[PDB]
Amino acid sequence: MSIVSQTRNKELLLKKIDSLIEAIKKIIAEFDVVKESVNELSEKAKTDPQAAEKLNKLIEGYTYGEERKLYDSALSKIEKLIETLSPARSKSQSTMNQRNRNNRKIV
């Protein structure tokens, strides 16, 4: 029944990769919209001292966005996988490429 194993495995990874690109493509789209939203919002909040403070801390949080940085680092993870799928600039040498340096003789 190997034939059913192959079909099940194939469909599994198929859907995983299909949705994979879909999700990522959506992320870039959402980010663009959010950035535009805060822009217009700041313009409206500027007409109020209280609102000004609301956006003051909001933009600050965006700057120190550790979570935002995590998303960027997520794309970096994918890069390593790509390099694994396609070495290209392979530095894998079958030798002791440690590059030691002693010197300075004594007695």
Added chain:
Amino acid sequence: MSIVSQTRNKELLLKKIDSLIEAIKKIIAEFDVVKESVNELSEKAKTDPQAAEKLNKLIEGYTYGEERKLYDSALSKIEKLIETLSPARSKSQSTMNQRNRNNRKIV
């Protein structure tokens, strides 16, 4: 309450992003397995004329695995998203960024 919006959105993409790289990690694993599987299977089929013919067309299909080629090209779409989110290496301007072989000497 906007706080519920932000929290729901945060967990939504945060979870889908970490799982995203996890799926890709599994993809490369299965790929390696399939490669070894066809190798072992072909050698086992070499001991029988009937199995040899079955594996003859089987390996043929794997070599011309349009599905395998599809998954490969899928990763290429991901690489595009990377350059789309953060070009850096790319430089697109309204000026002629092509440097033809001209003279341009100090005269």
